[PDB]
Amino acid sequence: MSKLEKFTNCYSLSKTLRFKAIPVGKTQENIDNKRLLVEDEKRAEDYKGVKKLLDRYYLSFINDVLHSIKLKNLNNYISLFRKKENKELENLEINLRKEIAKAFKGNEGYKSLFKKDIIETILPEDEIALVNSFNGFTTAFTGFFDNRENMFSEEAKSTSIAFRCINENLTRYISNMDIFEKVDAIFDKHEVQEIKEKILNSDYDVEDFFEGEFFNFVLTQEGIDVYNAIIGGFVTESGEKIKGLNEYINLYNQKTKQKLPKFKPLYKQVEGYTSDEEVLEVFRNTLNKNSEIFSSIKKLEKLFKNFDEYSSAGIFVKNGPAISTISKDIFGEWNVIRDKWNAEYDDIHLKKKAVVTEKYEDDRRKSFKKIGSFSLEQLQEYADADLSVVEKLKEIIIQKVDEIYKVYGSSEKLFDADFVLEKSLKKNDAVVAIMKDLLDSVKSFENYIKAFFGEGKETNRDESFYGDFVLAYDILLKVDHIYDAIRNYVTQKPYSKDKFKLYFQNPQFMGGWDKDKETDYRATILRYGSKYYLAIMDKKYAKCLQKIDKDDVNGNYEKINYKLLPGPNKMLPKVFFSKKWMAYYNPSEDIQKIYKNGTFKKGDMFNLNDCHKLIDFFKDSISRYPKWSNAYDFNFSETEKYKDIAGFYREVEEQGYKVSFESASKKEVDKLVEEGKLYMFQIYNKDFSDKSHGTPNLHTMYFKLLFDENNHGQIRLSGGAELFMRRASLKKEELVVHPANSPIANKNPDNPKKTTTLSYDVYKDKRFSEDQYELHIPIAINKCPKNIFKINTEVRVLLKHDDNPYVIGIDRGERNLLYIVVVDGKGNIVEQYSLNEIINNFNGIRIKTDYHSLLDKKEKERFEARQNWTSIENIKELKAGYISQVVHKICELVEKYDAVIALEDLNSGFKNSRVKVEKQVYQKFEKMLIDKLNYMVDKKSNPCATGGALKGYQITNKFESFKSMSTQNGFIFYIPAWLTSKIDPSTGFVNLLKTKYTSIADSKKFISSFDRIMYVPEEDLFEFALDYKNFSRTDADYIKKWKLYSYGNRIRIFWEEVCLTSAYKELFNKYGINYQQGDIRALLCEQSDKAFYSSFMALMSLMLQMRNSITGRTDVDFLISPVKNSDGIFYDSRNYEAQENAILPKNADANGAYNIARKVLWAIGQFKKAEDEKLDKVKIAISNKEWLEYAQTSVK
RNA sequence: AAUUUCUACUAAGUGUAGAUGGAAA
Ligand SMILES: [Mg+2]
Ligand SMILES: [Mg+2]
């Protein structure tokens, strides 16, 4: 049989639809008469205004609660913080977090908050007219309620004002208290508390307000601003201009050796993209010469001009990629400080033992990550002698602000306020890109200086630096908000997706659908022939649909009808115990008591007989209930098979749906449209057309099978459909046209037909140049799933009873975009091809489509376009569509082969400089991938068939997070692809040796670590046998014995082509060696010049090098292995390229793909070792040692 | 150079192929 035969009735899915609503008859004229546009347009307009009023009264509410609660744990907290044990402090910090959570939530009203009542009465106390108009429209603000209930939880996020008031502000407060205790000797009694307090408040002393017992009092924003008035100063309502205490420390530069830390301010809490001239004006206003941005930049200039004068111990930079970046900047290469730290740390932890284990490696990397921040002193230690790296980075930011000065001096001409913008933003792209150069210069500077924090939480620190540092940084951070705002106004389309929902004076509109409650819902899907429509009714004619007949007038319609049934588990005890049924039934007192206790629910109170008699009471009460017994010919299953109540809840849930058609008539309700008493919109797409012949949307098929009589098992709508309204963006006159009868030269270079001539004009994007109606319809999938199991485990069960599991290998290549391989469950490769060309199996002749040549044209355009954001979004979404094509090809291969799917993990993965497909692109790839695999249906089949819309394939769980993709989602496998590109598949061979030349002594020991170097004249080759245990870090090998050989040729990057043996022999004849008397390793060691051994190191690098690519031409990018097979031949890619189906791979792409296949093959081999109850606990992530053993042994 | 929307087209001439889950910040 097949292996896809279990992945149906597993779990639910919710989605929606989006469709065109075509006005039919007098409907557009009638809404134009009755003026149903301006009011919800105005409602959408002042929805932001009343939102702002809600924020205003929310600040009123929290300021009302901001006077009451007093805290106690602060007294021990300030001591255990300030006393220079952190797990105990964190355990008490949990108590602090709980106490402030209680102080936030459990007090002071806290009731009429996110309901109807607040906007119904409280905010009334347009503005009153606006709230009256906004009544009963709370659904428009439910999202605001969910958005605005965020501040009171335990989230510790930016939303959390408890985190915001404690975790930074109290800490900075106590540190400022202690700094005040440090510098209180310079504070004079005439200045710092007499004039300032007796002007500001005349309240209690500043030596009172430096106590921890006043932070609870100054928890308000008034305390925040009076704190920052102590720091900096205040206008004080006149021209008095009071001083600040930080300014007193500033004027304590009279000793010219200040060395005092400042005071940190407090964090309080709580726009653009309209016009081009507007955003350029706000750009100039944010970025002018006397702007706060500019002056903070100048502050950084003076600060980091005199940066060399402070504490090297008290300065810190964090961990990240930027430390490797600054390794490249200071010393020249990438991981230099990294392996310097390994050189120290392995002197510490590594003993005199030579081998480094894998656990040593991963825990060493874990320690490297765990040290999240660094003072400069160990960095100077890893630096060599006479290297002021602080002066080095000082000169780096000096030349960075020099280039900033350069872009200023070349770009200030737009800041001429008298100069006017002449053309559009889409026209003056030169100065647009100039502005872009400004912003990316600032962005590169902030990412470069972004390491200069240390994220501490640290020891003693130059806070005299760090306070002014974060003072400049708070101004200079929101440049990103400015950046992506103006990037958005760059990247926006010529149109927009602006839309506004319409209610027609009905808050009870479009929620329920199937039930006879359309006097409130007032809308119903209609059909004639195969053409589907939407009919909407007025309040005065809500029961217009009663007087409808079939009546055989040769005009007939199809009224959607029956009863959906939502929420049965909550609906049934309500309707059966609301006294409208207590009065109709007896009711039985024993089952009333059993329900009001709960002895049928699970949780060690459950009795199966009590549950079953509750079910049979539900049976007889439902069969006696008229509105459900006369709507469903009820046929449940038998009583004794019911294990619980939730299963029968799903049975009544599936039996609460019978949607089909009433036979209506046509002409009288078209007349009711014409009289204005019917509102009438045609459900529309492109595939509703008369011209519709090809392959429509799967979503349209979904819509059809809402009314397929055989879809009882079961796909059906979700209630609560919406309808928005999209006006025009551009004008129909103002479009550029390709005319009737005109030879229009085609764009695809793959069709032999190159020019199109057709007999009607087409416009510029006509659907976007007019005012159109858009319906939005939700859809339900698998509400009552039958086959429930644990997914990945049952996959492993199928693999346990497998005989020969086929597998898809999935990887991006270098000159290839994507590559897919077919391999069996015994490592025998079946099929392989790249996916650069993309073919459609379509009615007449199949035609391929290459995205690769497209991307080459786009990179050419971006080279002659100076990398504008238009090109960036261009190539990004070209990738985004391309991968959507890829995954359709993927799942087509899945339904062909019933295979298993494995991909490069990025939770530990890396990228190597060549594949165009990004981490973000690949992330989008896998997310759309797992979404497509969350339900899999071929359109072309019978929808009722296995694979069709009834019986498709839910093979995976829903997406959780980017970090959640952890080695498995069922058939999905997030693979550590370490050491998987440069790898011999034909034998199982890899180099482990670092071939960068270090020393001549290193060269000589590298020679003598080999045991035999022998020229052979039979093959005209060179024998290179070796033991890996005479080499460092070769622990993962299993064979370790390899006679390397050297025929063929390779490519120097420089591209440059070199053949191996000729290069060897010319070096040996130039340095004077009879090479025909091996072994001569001591004779190689006998040389002394640097040139021979460096060139020899280079030649050895060529020998171990396997991949060559010319990187400009698609063809000549080849591979070559140095070690023969089990029968005496090795593998080159040029000897297996021109093939159709061989056992070999074809390139590095197929190599890595075959690697993936062998990883999951080993995973199945592990599954063939343990018990079925243990397969969940089976560790999955293969390591290098058993990986190479698998590679060397299963190679046969 | 058309589209419920997105991508590549122009497929036999008002579309073709695919992907396509929205409201909320
Ligand atoms: Mg189609
Ligand atoms: Mg397009």
Side-chain angles (χ1 to χ4, degrees), chain A residues 1-106 109-125 127-253 255-258 260-1054 1056-1196:
Chain A
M1 295 304 293
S2 155
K3 296 160 287 325
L4 274 195
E5 294 170 341
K6 264 86 186 174
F7 317 118
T8 319
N9 282 318
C10 321
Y11 79 115
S12 281
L13 161 61
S14 62
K15 270 171 185 331
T16 175
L17 279 305
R18 233 209 308 264
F19 275 108
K20 179 69 202 81
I22 293 301
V24 172
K26 308 214 181 184
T27 48
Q28 164 59 73
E29 308 90 303
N30 268 114
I31 180 172
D32 198 341
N33 291 143
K34 300 189 177 187
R35 320 300 317 118
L36 268 292
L37 296 94
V38 294
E39 63 280 50
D40 65 359
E41 278 156 352
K42 189 181 289 292
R43 256 188 303 173
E45 283 142 38
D46 60 2
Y47 118 93
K48 281 87 62 187
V50 64
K51 170 180 189 201
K52 285 229 206 176
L53 311 183
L54 259 293
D55 308 300
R56 193 196 301 185
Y57 217 78
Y58 281 165
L59 309 184
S60 85
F61 190 81
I62 63 190
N63 275 107
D64 283 321
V65 314
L66 205 41
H67 317 295
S68 61
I69 315 104
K70 317 303 295 278
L71 197 140
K72 270 69 55 183
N73 316 329
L74 83 170
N75 194 28
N76 64 92
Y77 173 65
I78 58 169
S79 47
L80 173 53
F81 185 75
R82 86 180 288 190
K83 271 290 277 188
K84 181 40 69 172
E85 295 193 30
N86 289 165
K87 193 173 188 294
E88 280 84 52
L89 185 42
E90 196 274 334
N91 295 147
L92 272 299
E93 267 176 2
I94 300 149
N95 298 303
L96 290 164
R97 195 85 210 283
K98 285 150 52 200
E99 198 186 356
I100 64 187
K102 182 53 192 291
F104 266 36
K105 304 179 251 273
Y110 195 72
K111 33 178 200 294
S112 63
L113 262 46
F114 318 108
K115 212 178 290 184
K116 43 155 72 167
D117 43 16
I118 173 170
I119 68 185
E120 272 162 349
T121 40
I122 287 90
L123 268 289
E125 289 329 286
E127 314 158 343
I128 43 189
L130 312 174
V131 317
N132 188 358
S133 71
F134 267 73
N135 180 189
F137 314 131
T138 66
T139 72
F141 300 94
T142 52
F144 188 78
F145 283 158
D146 309 334
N147 217 350
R148 259 53 191 188
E149 59 96 22
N150 300 1
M151 300 180 180
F152 306 90
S153 172
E154 281 275 319
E155 285 322 291
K157 299 174 181 187
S158 316
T159 67
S160 47
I161 318 188
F163 178 83
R164 178 56 91 84
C165 66
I166 298 305
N167 285 251
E168 320 92 332
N169 286 54
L170 181 49
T171 56
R172 291 188 324 237
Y173 174 54
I174 304 311
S175 63
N176 284 353
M177 276 183 30
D178 300 337
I179 288 169
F180 154 73
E181 296 140 32
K182 173 174 178 289
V183 305
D184 194 24
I186 322 294
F187 291 139
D188 194 77
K189 272 81 179 173
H190 282 82
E191 322 161 351
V192 314
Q193 89 293 335
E194 269 298 280
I195 180 79
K196 310 198 167 178
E197 281 253 351
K198 290 305 168 290
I199 280 178
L200 265 291
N201 51 2
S202 64
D203 282 333
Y204 324 107
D205 192 65
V206 305
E207 273 81 5
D208 315 337
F209 278 90
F210 277 101
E211 79 185 3
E213 305 295 327
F214 272 177
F215 187 79
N216 44 2
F217 167 64
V218 308
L219 275 178
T220 188
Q221 69 270 25
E222 300 94 298
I224 290 179
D225 56 61
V226 73
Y227 188 103
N228 303 11
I230 301 147
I231 298 185
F234 196 36
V235 47
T236 73
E237 212 259 335
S238 45
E240 192 271 331
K241 314 306 178 225
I242 199 62
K243 267 82 177 174
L245 267 69
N246 271 24
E247 278 84 350
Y248 282 168
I249 304 152
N250 263 310
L251 62 96
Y252 204 40
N253 70 323
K255 70 190 193 87
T256 75
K257 45 171 188 62
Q258 177 254 355
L260 309 183
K262 291 287 187 184
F263 284 166
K264 308 273 204 170
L266 312 183
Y267 289 173
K268 209 182 288 190
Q269 78 273 20
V270 311
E271 278 77 30
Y273 52 87
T274 67
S275 156
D276 40 348
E277 314 93 1
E278 183 264 326
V279 291
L280 299 161
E281 271 320 292
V282 75
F283 159 73
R284 294 151 28 110
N285 276 257
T286 41
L287 273 301
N288 52 86
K289 318 294 290 179
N290 37 345
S291 53
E292 295 83 7
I293 285 181
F294 210 106
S295 46
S296 40
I297 287 157
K298 300 280 296 188
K299 277 158 166 292
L300 293 180
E301 298 162 39
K302 47 175 184 48
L303 161 66
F304 289 102
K305 202 69 64 67
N306 291 332
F307 197 52
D308 280 327
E309 276 77 4
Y310 324 110
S311 75
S312 85
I315 49 181
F316 302 105
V317 290
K318 62 186 79 52
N319 201 310
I323 54 173
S324 53
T325 318
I326 212 165
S327 175
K328 170 86 199 313
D329 306 308
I330 300 155
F331 299 103
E333 286 307 311
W334 301 70
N335 304 306
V336 176
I337 284 92
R338 182 179 184 272
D339 70 300
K340 280 309 285 296
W341 191 87
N342 308 131
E344 186 41 64
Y345 169 65
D346 304 346
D347 161 72
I348 297 152
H349 274 47
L350 177 49
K351 307 306 163 216
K352 62 184 180 294
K353 188 71 181 301
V355 59
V356 166
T357 68
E358 44 88 19
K359 198 174 178 281
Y360 199 92
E361 288 139 35
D362 55 56
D363 295 330
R364 173 198 67 230
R365 187 185 259 106
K366 279 160 206 192
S367 60
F368 202 94
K369 301 316 150 283
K370 201 150 67 170
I371 309 300
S373 282
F374 323 98
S375 175
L376 271 293
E377 293 173 340
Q378 66 272 32
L379 319 174
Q380 196 88 5
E381 283 144 40
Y382 292 144
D384 220 357
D386 319 278
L387 300 181
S388 179
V389 309
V390 54
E391 276 260 12
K392 167 69 168 263
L393 58 95
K394 173 174 287 213
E395 293 296 325
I396 295 151
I397 53 189
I398 273 166
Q399 50 85 41
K400 275 155 169 50
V401 69
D402 284 341
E403 300 325 287
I404 285 159
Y405 274 135
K406 281 205 80 173
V407 70
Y408 284 167
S410 44
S411 70
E412 86 294 333
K413 300 207 166 187
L414 66 98
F415 295 91
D416 306 333
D418 53 356
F419 170 66
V420 58
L421 167 66
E422 55 276 10
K423 303 164 205 175
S424 82
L425 69 153
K426 195 255 293 179
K427 283 181 159 315
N428 274 334
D429 316 297
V431 61
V432 177
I434 290 307
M435 209 278 278
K436 182 181 179 297
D437 304 302
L438 271 301
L439 260 297
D440 60 52
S441 61
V442 185
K443 208 171 199 72
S444 44
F445 200 94
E446 59 85 20
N447 294 117
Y448 185 72
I449 208 76
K450 208 172 57 167
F452 282 63
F453 190 35
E455 57 96 28
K457 308 183 297 308
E458 273 153 343
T459 174
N460 43 2
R461 36 197 298 160
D462 205 284
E463 289 312 290
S464 66
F465 162 71
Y466 267 101
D468 275 292
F469 146 75
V470 65
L471 173 83
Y473 187 50
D474 54 59
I475 289 305
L476 291 178
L477 59 91
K478 312 169 290 322
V479 308
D480 45 20
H481 206 97
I482 303 149
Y483 175 88
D484 52 9
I486 68 194
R487 188 174 90 164
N488 281 16
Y489 197 80
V490 160
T491 186
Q492 31 76 28
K493 285 281 191 94
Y495 40 83
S496 184
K497 290 194 178 188
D498 305 340
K499 52 181 180 291
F500 45 96
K501 206 261 174 190
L502 315 101
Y503 295 85
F504 323 109
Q505 297 178 355
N506 193 12
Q508 329 279 297
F509 196 66
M510 294 184 60
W513 288 87
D514 298 358
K515 180 180 180 300
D516 203 3
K517 195 182 178 293
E518 297 92 351
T519 191
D520 311 329
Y521 301 135
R522 302 240 304 275
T524 289
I525 305 308
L526 189 53
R527 195 264 292 273
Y528 180 42
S530 315
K531 259 67 182 170
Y532 282 83
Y533 309 110
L534 178 48
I536 308 103
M537 59 184 39
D538 196 76
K539 35 174 181 183
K540 312 302 196 317
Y541 305 101
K543 290 157 194 172
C544 58
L545 73 157
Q546 313 318 300
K547 49 180 79 67
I548 316 296
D549 201 4
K550 176 172 202 65
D551 66 86
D552 312 331
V553 76
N554 282 177
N556 276 119
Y557 278 162
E558 286 188 357
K559 173 186 294 170
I560 188 61
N561 258 179
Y562 295 93
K563 293 182 179 180
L564 58 91
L565 194 145
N569 47 356
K570 274 80 185 172
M571 181 179 180
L572 199 84
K574 190 262 181 182
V575 64
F576 282 171
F577 280 128
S578 64
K579 99 185 177 182
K580 183 61 180 60
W581 194 259
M582 297 182 178
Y584 194 81
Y585 213 62
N586 175 75
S588 190
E589 193 263 354
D590 39 18
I591 193 155
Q592 277 176 105
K593 184 55 75 149
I594 286 300
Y595 175 65
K596 80 183 57 185
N597 307 317
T599 66
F600 59 95
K601 325 167 187 167
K602 295 301 172 63
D604 199 74
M605 48 196 175
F606 153 77
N607 324 294
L608 183 46
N609 52 6
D610 295 337
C611 166
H612 271 169
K613 57 99 181 185
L614 184 53
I615 299 163
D616 287 89
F617 154 72
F618 286 152
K619 305 266 199 152
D620 91 318
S621 45
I622 285 283
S623 50
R624 197 176 290 171
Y625 193 76
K627 326 178 193 72
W628 282 328
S629 50
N630 310 339
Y632 311 96
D633 314 328
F634 272 126
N635 301 278
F636 302 134
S637 90
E638 202 56 39
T639 76
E640 85 281 333
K641 186 199 52 53
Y642 299 142
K643 195 256 179 155
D644 217 7
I645 181 61
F648 187 67
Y649 273 162
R650 303 302 96 80
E651 308 321 315
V652 294
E653 169 184 297
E654 51 87 15
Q655 277 188 46
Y657 294 120
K658 201 299 180 180
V659 184
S660 295
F661 298 118
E662 184 263 357
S663 162
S665 163
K666 162 156 184 48
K667 53 175 290 184
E668 83 289 5
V669 312
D670 303 358
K671 169 193 187 178
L672 188 84
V673 182
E674 292 141 32
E675 294 152 320
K677 322 182 169 205
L678 198 164
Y679 316 108
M680 176 39 234
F681 277 108
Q682 180 252 329
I683 319 166
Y684 189 63
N685 41 49
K686 36 198 165 274
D687 54 78
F688 262 113
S689 162
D690 43 357
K691 317 294 189 42
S692 309
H693 48 269
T695 322
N697 190 330
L698 181 49
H699 312 335
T700 57
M701 305 322 295
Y702 295 161
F703 171 69
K704 313 314 305 188
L705 64 94
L706 181 48
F707 321 103
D708 175 71
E709 85 277 31
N710 322 111
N711 180 22
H712 49 274
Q714 178 76 89
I715 307 102
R716 71 275 155 209
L717 60 94
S718 301
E722 281 55 50
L723 157 61
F724 277 59
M725 185 45 216
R726 166 183 71 181
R727 300 295 191 92
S729 88
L730 302 180
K731 277 187 164 57
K732 189 250 169 183
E733 188 176 1
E734 296 193 358
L735 326 176
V736 358
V737 194
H738 290 358
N741 309 325
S742 64
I744 313 155
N746 307 344
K747 190 50 75 185
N748 174 37
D750 313 333
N751 185 12
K753 169 179 183 308
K754 312 302 191 199
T755 305
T756 313
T757 304
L758 256 180
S759 88
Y760 50 91
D761 291 30
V762 278
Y763 274 92
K764 167 114 198 209
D765 276 300
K766 148 196 89 46
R767 77 182 165 300
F768 293 144
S769 185
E770 280 197 0
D771 302 1
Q772 307 308 120
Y773 316 85
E774 292 85 12
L775 180 53
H776 321 260
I777 315 99
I779 169 69
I781 295 95
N782 207 8
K783 215 181 289 182
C784 323
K786 179 61 64 200
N787 204 341
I788 319 295
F789 55 93
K790 183 53 204 71
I791 304 106
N792 319 359
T793 61
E794 263 299 322
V795 181
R796 295 172 192 203
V797 182
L798 176 50
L799 301 153
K800 180 66 166 187
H801 306 312
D802 202 305
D803 49 343
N804 184 29
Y806 295 163
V807 49
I808 177 169
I810 305 102
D811 189 27
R812 34 193 179 172
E814 299 89 2
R815 330 289 309 272
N816 298 14
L817 319 177
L818 265 304
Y819 209 105
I820 292 308
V821 70
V822 189
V823 194
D824 67 342
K826 220 201 291 190
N828 323 316
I829 310 182
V830 179
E831 186 182 3
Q832 40 159 335
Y833 43 88
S834 195
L835 275 302
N836 291 36
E837 279 297 347
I838 285 301
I839 322 99
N840 45 358
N841 279 331
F842 93 71
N843 302 180
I845 65 180
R846 357 198 161 167
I847 180 63
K848 49 183 72 68
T849 46
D850 182 61
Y851 300 79
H852 167 94
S853 40
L854 305 170
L855 175 50
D856 305 315
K857 281 144 103 161
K858 324 304 174 216
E859 206 283 335
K860 166 176 183 59
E861 285 145 11
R862 92 157 168 83
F863 191 80
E864 279 105 22
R866 286 85 44 198
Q867 297 84 232
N868 46 65
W869 287 324
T870 68
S871 58
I872 308 304
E873 56 85 19
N874 265 302
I875 62 184
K876 175 170 179 174
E877 266 71 14
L878 293 159
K879 290 165 118 189
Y882 157 72
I883 59 187
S884 72
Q885 310 317 96
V886 177
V887 292
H888 183 205
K889 300 258 179 168
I890 297 177
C891 55
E892 279 160 325
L893 266 295
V894 181
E895 55 83 21
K896 185 160 179 176
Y897 287 95
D898 213 316
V900 280
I901 305 96
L903 73 150
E904 162 196 14
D905 167 82
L906 265 302
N907 312 286
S908 314
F910 305 100
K911 190 256 169 161
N912 38 5
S913 159
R914 266 89 63 196
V915 49
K916 269 79 173 176
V917 180
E918 206 197 8
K919 207 159 163 175
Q920 314 175 350
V921 181
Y922 194 77
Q923 264 181 340
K924 264 276 173 186
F925 144 76
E926 47 87 11
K927 189 150 153 289
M928 306 315 200
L929 165 140
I930 184 177
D931 198 341
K932 192 66 199 86
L933 302 187
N934 274 295
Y935 188 40
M936 262 306 314
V937 166
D938 166 69
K939 161 146 194 312
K940 303 177 170 296
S941 90
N942 171 29
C944 322
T946 60
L950 267 188
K951 297 180 185 293
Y953 312 115
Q954 31 179 335
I955 72 163
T956 178
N957 287 305
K958 285 187 168 70
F959 168 76
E960 169 189 6
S961 76
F962 272 160
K963 309 304 287 188
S964 62
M965 47 156 272
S966 317
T967 74
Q968 183 136 14
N969 202 326
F971 301 91
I972 305 309
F973 298 103
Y974 316 101
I975 302 303
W978 271 20
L979 319 164
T980 51
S981 83
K982 309 133 202 186
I983 178 63
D984 185 15
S986 64
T987 62
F989 188 58
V990 67
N991 180 29
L992 310 177
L993 309 175
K994 299 294 198 173
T995 180
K996 155 203 154 185
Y997 160 74
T998 47
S999 88
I1000 309 299
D1002 291 17
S1003 75
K1004 290 184 191 179
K1005 64 97 179 179
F1006 193 78
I1007 291 151
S1008 43
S1009 46
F1010 264 71
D1011 47 351
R1012 164 67 55 88
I1013 294 179
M1014 169 78 87
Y1015 164 74
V1016 55
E1018 308 156 353
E1019 295 167 347
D1020 211 10
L1021 278 192
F1022 297 96
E1023 159 171 308
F1024 276 76
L1026 87 168
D1027 164 47
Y1028 270 153
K1029 294 174 300 309
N1030 312 335
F1031 288 90
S1032 67
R1033 313 163 190 189
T1034 60
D1035 51 353
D1037 195 298
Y1038 178 59
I1039 290 300
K1040 310 174 174 65
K1041 275 78 176 176
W1042 318 87
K1043 279 196 177 183
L1044 289 88
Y1045 284 93
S1046 165
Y1047 75 68
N1049 51 3
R1050 280 94 189 275
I1051 296 295
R1052 182 182 189 179
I1053 172 67
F1054 210 78
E1056 160 71 18
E1057 189 266 351
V1058 182
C1059 164
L1060 300 101
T1061 76
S1062 42
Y1064 297 150
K1065 288 182 179 183
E1066 64 85 32
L1067 206 73
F1068 304 151
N1069 299 343
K1070 196 209 59 178
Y1071 288 116
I1073 292 96
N1074 310 346
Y1075 55 91
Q1076 297 88 323
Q1077 294 87 359
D1079 198 9
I1080 42 179
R1081 273 183 299 109
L1083 190 145
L1084 314 178
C1085 276
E1086 211 269 333
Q1087 326 303 296
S1088 88
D1089 70 287
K1090 199 280 207 186
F1092 160 71
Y1093 290 101
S1094 51
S1095 45
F1096 205 96
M1097 195 59 157
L1099 261 56
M1100 288 325 102
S1101 80
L1102 316 184
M1103 182 154 193
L1104 58 90
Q1105 179 43 253
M1106 62 195 90
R1107 179 214 290 279
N1108 303 279
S1109 160
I1110 200 166
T1111 71
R1113 184 189 336 166
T1114 173
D1115 168 56
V1116 277
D1117 312 293
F1118 72 98
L1119 266 293
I1120 171 172
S1121 57
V1123 277
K1124 307 190 304 170
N1125 65 329
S1126 297
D1127 301 329
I1129 190 66
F1130 46 69
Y1131 166 53
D1132 190 287
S1133 43
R1134 305 174 326 167
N1135 310 54
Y1136 287 99
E1137 37 186 356
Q1139 267 142 32
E1140 296 86 4
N1141 41 2
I1143 193 48
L1144 269 299
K1146 284 213 302 308
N1147 45 15
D1149 314 331
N1151 190 4
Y1154 177 56
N1155 275 50
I1156 302 160
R1158 292 194 89 169
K1159 311 303 180 140
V1160 287
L1161 164 74
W1162 171 92
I1164 312 306
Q1166 302 332 104
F1167 298 150
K1168 296 291 185 179
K1169 292 174 175 60
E1171 323 303 311
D1172 302 338
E1173 310 263 341
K1174 316 294 297 175
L1175 304 187
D1176 49 355
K1177 291 161 294 203
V1178 165
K1179 194 256 185 177
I1180 300 303
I1182 185 174
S1183 90
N1184 323 322
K1185 204 191 212 62
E1186 80 272 26
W1187 154 237
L1188 298 193
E1189 175 146 359
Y1190 212 71
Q1192 281 140 54
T1193 58
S1194 50
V1195 83
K1196 78 180 292 296

